Backbone:
């Protein structure tokens, strides 16, 4: 078994496309800064803390 | 450095095989809807929220 | 869109290199047992539970 992480630009695309992305595939909604993992029948959003500066 | 996500069907397989999967490798137990990441000496289960419908 | 997980040995390397690693790329600081995901402008550390024994 194996998977990956799928990048997205808006919670738009990912919502009309979470249909394909097979089980156990992280789902990144970049503009929303949201990471969910594709589960059995729908998705389960993983908990992250507030952002840490980059510079 | 680089890794990936490893898919599984039951908390069975993943338990007798978490031995190989090297550090920093997410571990997905599909049937359990559990995502853990392989750490230094054992695994650290990542926190997810309750499932969001797919349809 | 697509990404991956990037492995590191110390919160050193990852701090001077979180600059490259593009959006939506998990970041693993192995020695710290920390998993963050690279977001819009800096990183957002994902929440994990305490470690589970491996043996």
Residues:
């Amino acid at each position: 078994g194996s998977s990956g992480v799928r990048l997205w630009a808006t919670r738009q695309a990912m919502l009309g496309q979470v249909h394909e992305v097979p089980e156990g595939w992280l789902i990144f909604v970049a503009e929303q800064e949201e990471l969910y993992v594709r589960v059995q029948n729908g998705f389960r959003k993983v908990q992250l803390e507030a952002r840490t500066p980059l510079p």
User: Anything to note?
Assistant: The first strand of chain B starts at residue 5 and ends at 8. The interface with chain C takes residues 1-5, 18-19, 23-26, 36-37, 39-47 of chain B (CB under 8 Å). The longest helix of chain B spans residues 13-17.
